[PDB]
Amino acid sequence: DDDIAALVVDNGSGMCKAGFAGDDAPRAVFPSIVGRPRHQGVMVGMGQKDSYVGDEAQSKRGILTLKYPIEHGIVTNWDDMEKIWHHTFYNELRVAPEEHPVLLTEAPLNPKANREKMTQIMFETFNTPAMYVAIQAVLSLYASGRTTGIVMDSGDGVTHTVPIYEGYALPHAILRLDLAGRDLTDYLMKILTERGYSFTTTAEREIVRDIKEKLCYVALDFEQEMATAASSSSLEKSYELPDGQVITIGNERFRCPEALFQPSFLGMESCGIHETTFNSIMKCDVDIRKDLYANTVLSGGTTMYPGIADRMQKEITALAPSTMKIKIIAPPERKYSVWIGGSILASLSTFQQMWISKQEYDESGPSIVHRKCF
Amino acid sequence: DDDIAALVVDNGSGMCKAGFAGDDAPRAVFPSIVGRPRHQGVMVGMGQKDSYVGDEAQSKRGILTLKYPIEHGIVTNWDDMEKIWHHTFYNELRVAPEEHPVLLTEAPLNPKANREKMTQIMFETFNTPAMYVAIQAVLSLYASGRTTGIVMDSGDGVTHTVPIYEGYALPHAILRLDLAGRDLTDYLMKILTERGYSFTTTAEREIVRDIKEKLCYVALDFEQEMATAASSSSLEKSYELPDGQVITIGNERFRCPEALFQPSFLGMESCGIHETTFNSIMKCDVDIRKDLYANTVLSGGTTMYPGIADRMQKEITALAPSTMKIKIIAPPERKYSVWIGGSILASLSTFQQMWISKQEYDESGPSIVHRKCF
Amino acid sequence: DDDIAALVVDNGSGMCKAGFAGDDAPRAVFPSIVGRPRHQGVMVGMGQKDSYVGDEAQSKRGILTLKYPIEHGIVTNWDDMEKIWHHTFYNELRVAPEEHPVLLTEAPLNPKANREKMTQIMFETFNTPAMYVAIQAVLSLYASGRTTGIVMDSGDGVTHTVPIYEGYALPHAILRLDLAGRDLTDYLMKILTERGYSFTTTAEREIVRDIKEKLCYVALDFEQEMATAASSSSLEKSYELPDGQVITIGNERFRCPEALFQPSFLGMESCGIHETTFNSIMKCDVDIRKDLYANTVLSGGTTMYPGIADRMQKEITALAPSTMKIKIIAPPERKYSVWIGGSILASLSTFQQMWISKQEYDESGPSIVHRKCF
Amino acid sequence: MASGVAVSDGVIKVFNDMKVRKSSTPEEVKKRKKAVLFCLSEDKKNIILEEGKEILVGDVGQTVDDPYATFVKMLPDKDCRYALYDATYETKESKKEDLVFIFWAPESAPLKSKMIYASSKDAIKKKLTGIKHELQANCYEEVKDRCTLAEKLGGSAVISLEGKPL
Amino acid sequence: MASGVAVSDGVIKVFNDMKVRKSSTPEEVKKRKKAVLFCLSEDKKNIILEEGKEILVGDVGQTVDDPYATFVKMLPDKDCRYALYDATYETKESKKEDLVFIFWAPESAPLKSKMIYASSKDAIKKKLTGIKHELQANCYEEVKDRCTLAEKLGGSAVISLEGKPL
Incomplete structure (x- = not known):
């Protein structure tokens, strides 16, 4: 309350979520759907106002066409995306964007054209004082306190495999599964x-x-x-x-x-997806493969099914050559680990130094986001 | 008459039918309803014998409770189902089951537990010498002489979409519409x-x-x-x-x-259902989509309304991207096509080799039906 | 037709090809994949016949395990390789091996153990009257009419750098890029x-x-x-x-x-690969380096992308010390140059004198292939 | 249904002949079978080759320049038959040959013969041990058209199905 | 019937205030309106906000720890009124806020006022531009009960409507 609590917006194919810093999990979670007239609207008096974002639209799915602002971790239609941000601050969070800076999540290996433009919308469309872009897989490995390893991320809408060595994701070890x-x-x-x-x-x-x-x-x-x-x-x-x-x-x-x-x-x-994780390891450097087995992290959306941890050990053991130790890292807060990593490091004081500000964007322009990260 | 004419029993939500091999259509069609006392029987002298199967029960609907042996292509209550088979052979067909082997139809993606048990009842309850299980959608595509394609089946009780490639139905392309x-x-x-x-x-x-x-x-x-x-x-x-x-x-x-x-x-x-067929195609492999359009078959129950063929062409053309040929396969005997496909290939001589017999069931048991198909 | 048209089989990691002499390019090109049961075969009735070679197997990749007969220009598993030769003659070429002699291509610096054995299989397994072993890089330089130079070969499956002086490849100037x-x-x-x-x-x-x-x-x-x-x-x-x-x-x-x-x-x-070609030149004798620049040949698989010739000139100029002429040799038929070099010199009459025959193998044995070349 | 017919050894015998070509001299290269018609004999117990109806590659040189037309003429929708045809087509380098089984299953053909044929496709290809590519039409226009044969090829890299029609 | 009332601009003005919170300092966070009472003024031509009756979130800290009770007290079945209330509830992670319109339409209320109110729900929500969730009761027991507010939530994942009642 007051300094800059940090509003975090987590985006994915569906089941998006948001909250405030210092929290142990996000405050609110909502569906990602947008609806406008379908099949001429279903009869008697069509024209009205239609662009529903949230779960109110879910009931209205039969009479409204739904378009996905996010398709498997990326944004193709910006018009739908803007409605979601408007609705999240004003209707879901019920907090003014102006007092609190917003952090936006991104899918691994997010295209360059999108990265400059999303920053552009925050500064002019919503006049947000500060914002930052983070990767869901990076934070989950980061959360366990380990920088070397491979993370299998169960997203709320899309699952990505992203081995991380020293904060850097491996482009040749990442695959998209829907x-x-x-x-x-x-x-x-x-x-x-x-x-x-x-x-x-x-x-x-x-x-x-x-x-x-x-x-x-x-x-x-x-x-x-x-x-x-x-x-x-x-x-x-x-x-x-x-x-x-x-x-x-x-x-x-x-x-x-x-x-x-x-x-x-x-x-x-x-x-199978577990096998898919294995292919990434095969492609990876042989010397660090043993370290990777002890560095595996399970986080997100549906990994919280009980007995899943037990199954993973069995399949990996069968897939792996043998003669070595396989260890799985299990954080209690794995469902909210993606959001949790973003929430805590957004308000300390030394994170003030690192913020990308509205004032900076006006000077350098779209080019600034590429330049200050690492 | 004599060798094994093949009794074919066609089951669905309602309007079931049966006949003999060599026929161009089934001999008899009856309603699928079973009745027992409702509302205490309606007054004066209740107890009697009540379990009516056929259209005699339809009149008696007010005084008897009707239960559906088949709910949308599957059987939940076996007790009602047995009465139908007893009544069909002894009262509707008026032919002894013992001389003639019986063929039973099934809905696409029929559950495994049911498949072993239905076979079990024929061998012990009615002592039938031979029986076989077939799929209504498969036969209809098969009837046109084409193995590659998509069939929209208008059942007498339930409508199923079942694209078929090489005798194999696509599990990811089938939806149930009631x-x-x-x-x-x-x-x-x-x-x-x-x-x-x-x-x-x-x-x-x-x-x-x-x-x-x-x-x-x-x-x-x-x-x-x-x-x-x-x-x-x-x-x-x-x-x-x-x-x-x-x-x-x-x-x-x-x-x-x-x-x-x-x-x-x-x-x-x-x-709309026509749209539903389109979704199955979208999910399907892109390369074979053009072939699928030329392989479409219309068969069963209510597809025989005149002008239906003309309407289908219009909606598919509007739904489809464009720039390509759309062809509809129209067999003269489409109403009886489901039954017709089953009737002809049940008595040739080389279909003797392929029959599942009572003697085989006694040895292997319930497991046998899964093992000899393909 | 009749004398000995010469069947040429071109082998690589993938996209293998074959044809007849007098041709300006190979008649047929097919994928190099072999499949047998994977993941228990995918359900219901497993055992069957499975060993598919060609592009029919590509569709079947999900249900069959694929093994590479050729790994980056060499053969590790002979069982898979035999199926390819059987399929190529009988199913792809559709010509009897007995009337027409077969020529087999090889990767540069091919191991000695493999060379004796491949010859061994042709003579006893397929009873071929005549065969010859050739190098893809040698023929491409040869095709341009130049014996002195360096060839960067874009294979259908593997890229090899092979500077050639007087028909002899330089062992100290060859590197493998995948x-x-x-x-x-x-x-x-x-x-x-x-x-x-x-x-x-x-x-x-x-x-x-x-x-x-x-x-x-x-x-x-x-x-x-x-x-x-x-x-x-x-x-x-x-x-x-x-x-x-x-x-x-x-x-x-x-x-x-x-x-x-x-x-x-x-x-x-x-x-970068263009740089890799440069390293080979640096290792090479200084006096002939100027000649090598004027003797460069671009041939094979993917070199046919337009604008590639223009790019090569720029990078080589930047990489090279300066003060000298850089010339690139561009044959119109560069995509088929590897196959083309082998096809023409297989049926003239004086190439009859030079053929390695089945009759000769029976006498000397495996040792014969090493002895008659140069 | 599953596999209406079991095999009579006749199809394999003729198919085997096509597979090895059974030719050497100029005399029998022209007697090679570009296309062969297969049908099931009466009672439909056995599958065989029809002696009366077949197409030879030698015909193009001998007297008929369009084998893929004669096939159209001798395959009425009136009769339902099984056939093997050699592609024999040019793709901008030279020409090869794709083995294709041609299924002629006209909806309009007499129901009694046609119905066994339709039901027997799994059984007929069962002995085919999986076949590379197939063309199937239930009418003269699809069988007649050059494009259907070209569809198999891909169609964006084929200027001449028979060296002239496309 | 369709929409008994057309709007007087008053409701939108107060609703707008709730939507943005109109707060920054600690002084006005507690003056934010947890609940507001809406009614239609005499002649029922116009719909407005009642100055006399409203609920503040600051009240929970200031002196009253159960805002959702005061609302029950100040909403007799004797008078029929329209209201907006903020959910302010905890679901096992933290707490958010659902905007809910509370319809108080007691059957037993004076017929003359109540009847216009009943008929005006389409008209009142017409200006609401579709509202997320709603709670409606015609008696004290339904308004009084914790469970009715919890029903909206789902009720299987909420241990504490106000951090104590459930």
């Missing part, structure tokens, strides 16, 4: 439907999100687990629906997370 | 009522079914058509009611089919 | 993705190959070019996708080739 958090929610509903439950409208899609944090589990061994499931017994697990019925989930408890590990269930011929 | 044939019949009655005709009892619901094949039409262009309708003129079309009155239908001729295309009239915010 | 043609295709897709286009599956990787010959360009000056690119204007260039969308490429037109010149974009600390 399954992260929101996509799994779609998937969970899809398999739930197969057993015998009715899902035909986008309105009830949101309901399975609640299901995801409470009921997503990872099995120690998938095939052995499948045999246990057929008999049922204690496998079935209770869940709460707003109406009152409880949808029982038995062998779906472990199978859902498995899609990341085993894409074949989806219908994809693509290699 | 409006197909029986539901439209309910809908047709519902809009008929709005104009000024009295429908208040389930007994006369069946009457509109007759109306559906004779009077359902699809307009070349819906909005232009609506303007023509207001003046009336030749739009009004005659129909026969058992009693003698004729219910005249004018602008309802094209509007009913439109509900599939334009769900908004129902009160649904959901995208 | 970026040539197939690798660039992977790279082009990788940077295309960064701008905002979706590539997540190996199936569409092949599509960018088409992009490579049509859209790869080299700029006269890279940094000046980058400034021009930001404004866009006429930089954006159209391309055809099988589906219908056109992916526009603007500043990527010149940047892709630049990776060979400037490895830093990849994330490599390694010196």
Whole structure:
């Protein structure tokens, strides 16, 4: 309150979030959707005001066309993006941007054209006194107190692999995978439907999100687990629906997370994501490979499914040559680790020296962001 | 007659059907409803025998509770399902199951637990010598003589989209839509009522079914058509009611089919079914998309409304990017195409080699059905 | 037709090719991949026949493990290699090996153990009447009609620097660089993705190959070019996708080739390939260095990008001490120059005298190949 | 359904002939089979080669300059047949040959014969051990057109399907 | 019916104040309006803000620790009024704020005033340009209860509506 609390806006494909410095997690989380007339608006009196940002738009999905301001970690349409920032400060955070400086997150290997322009909008469109751009993968490794290693980041909307050595990400070790958090929610509903439950409208899609944090589990061994499931017994697990019925989930408890590990269930011929992390290591320098195994960090969106840590150890051991130690770094606050890293180092006093200010932008121009980082 | 004519049982949400091999269409079609006491049975002397399967039960709907053995292409309650098979052989087909082997149809992406058990009931409950499980969408594409393509299947009870490449269905390109044939019949009655005709009892619901094949039409262009309708003129079309009155239908001729295309009239915010087929194509591999357009097949239940073929071409052209050829495959026997595909390849001689027999089930067990297909 | 047309098989890391004598280029070109079960085969009925060679296997990459018969110009696994020769004659060329003798290409400084064994397989496994082993770099210099010089060879899979004086390659002037043609295709897709286009599956990787010959360009000056690119204007260039969308490429037109010149974009600390050619010259005898500059030849796989010749002159001039003439030899048929050199001198009549025959191998044995060359 | 027919050894015998060419002298190079028609004999128990109907490469030199037209003439939508045809096309360097199986499955053909044919494609290619490329049309216009054969090729690098039509 | 009232500019003025907070120093953070009461003035031609009745966030620190109770006290079923209240609640990470319009439409309230109010909800939210979430009760028990405010939240992830009641 007063000095410059630091407003942090975290952007991704979906499930964006924001808060204040000194916090242990972000204050508010909202959906990333924008809607305007679709199918002529659905009948009787069309024209009105339509550009809805937030979860109010989710209900309105049938009558409004949704466009993604962010496609898999990048921004293609700026008009949609501006509405999100307006709505976040004025409606979601309910704090004036003018008193508090804003920090914006970025996807790894973010294109250069976008980087100069986002800075440009903050200074003239919202007149923000200070802002900074950070990488979600860098902060997560940073949070554990380790600068050398490889981080598998489960984003709220997109999953990126970004090995980090001395603050520098490896361009030749980074790959983009599109399954992260929101996509799994779609998937969970899809398999739930197969057993015998009715899902035909986008309105009830949101309901399975609640299901995801409470009921997503990872099995120690998938095939052995499948045999246990057929008999049922204690496998079935209770869940709460707003109406009152409880949808029982038995062998779906472990199978859902498995899609990341085993894409074949989806219908994809693509290699599993854990394997994908392994390819990055193979490409990496041989001498530091042993260090990388002891430097692995799990953070973000859907990594919080219980039993996931146990599964990761097993697959990596099978994938790895052998004869060596594999260690996984597990921070208690892994779900909020991406946001948490950004929040704390934004108000100390010596971070004042380092801020990119509005006044500086006016002088040098767009070129300034490239010049002061490292 | 004698060798093994092959009894084919076609199952769906409603309007199930069966016949013999060498036929060009199924011999008999019946409703899928089962009834037991409701509202204490309706007064004076309750207990009796009640479990009615067929259209005799339809009259009895008011005094018997109806349960659906099949819910949108799958079986949840086996007790109801057994009655249907008993009634079909002994009462509807009037042929002994013992001389003739039976073929059972299945919905696309049918759950594994059900697949082993249905096989189990045929071998022990009815002692059938031979049986086989087939997919309605696969046969329809197969019938046209084309193995590569996408089939939109209008089922008698449920509509499924199932693109097929080399006999294999695409798990990532299949979606479940609940409006197909029986539901439209309910809908047709519902809009008929709005104009000024009295429908208040389930007994006369069946009457509109007759109306559906004779009077359902699809307009070349819906909005232009609506303007023509207001003046009336030749739009009004005659129909026969058992009693003698004729219910005249004018602008309802094209509007009913439109509900599939334009769900908004129902009160649904959901995208039109033709559009839904398009989403499957978008998800599909880009290189084969042009081939898919020339490989499209229309088959089943309510696709036989005249003018439907003309409407499909228009919407697909608007939905598609442009600059390319769109071709629709139209088999004369499209209503019976699902059943027809199953009937012919069940008695040649080399289909003897391929049959799953009762004797084999006793040895391997439930596991056998998964093992011999492909 | 009849005397001994000479079948030439050109081997490399990928994109192998073959044809007949008297031709101006090879008749057929195919991918070098071999596949067998991966991830247990992907579900339902595994065992079958799997060992696919050609581009049919490319689609099947998700369900089959691919092994490289050739790793960067050499053969480690012979079992995969045999399938390629079987498939090339019987399925790709569609010509009987028995009537036509086969010529096999080799990478510069090919190990001795491999050289005796490849000869061994042709004589007993395929019973070929005649065969010969040639070097791709030697033929390219030879093609220009010049025996003294240095050739930078852009292979279809691997790039080798091989200065040649009097038919003899210089062992102390040859270095192996792994970026040539197939690798660039992977790279082009990788940077295309960064701008905002979706590539997540190996199936569409092949599509960018088409992009490579049509859209790869080299700029006269890279940094000046980058400034021009930001404004866009006429930089954006159209391309055809099988589906219908056109992916526009603007500043990527010149940047892709630049990776060979400037490895830093990849994330490599390694010196540029053009520079690598220069190191070979520095090591070489000082007196003949001026002759070498006038004897430089550009041939193979991806050297056919327009503007590449213009770029080479600039970098060599900057790298070279000065005060002297630099001349580049440019043969019209440079893409097919490697194959072309082998094709013509295989059927004249006096090349009959020089052939290594099956009959000779039986007498002397494996030792014969070392003895008759020079 | 899965695989309507099991194989009669006849198809393999003729296919094998095409695979090795079975030719040396100028006399039999022209007797090589550019295209062969396959059908299933009555009762549809067995799959064989039709003696009456076939296309020879020698024909282009001998008397007919458009083999891919004769095929169109001898393949009525009225009869449903299986066929193998050699691509024999030029792509701006020289010409090679792609083995393609041509499926003629007209919707309009007599239902009784056509229906077994349609259902038998998995079975017929089952013995084909996976085939490289395929062309399938249910009408004369698709079979007649040069472009459908060219589609397989890619179509942006082929100026002459037969050295003249494109 | 459709929209009983057209707007008098007063509601927008006070609403705008809440939207930007109109605060900087510690002195006015506590003078921010947690809740505001809106009603339609006599003749019901215009909709305005009631000067007499409002709730301040500063009150929790100043002297009253339960703003959501005072609101219950000053909202008799006897009078029908429109209100804006800030959620100010904790969900197991920290706390934010949801803008909610509170509709007080008691059935038992004097019919003459209440009837215009009931009919005016479309008109009142018409100027609200669609509002995020709303709470509506026609009796003291629903307004009094913690759970109704928590229902909006979801209720399975909220241990403390005001940091103590739940």
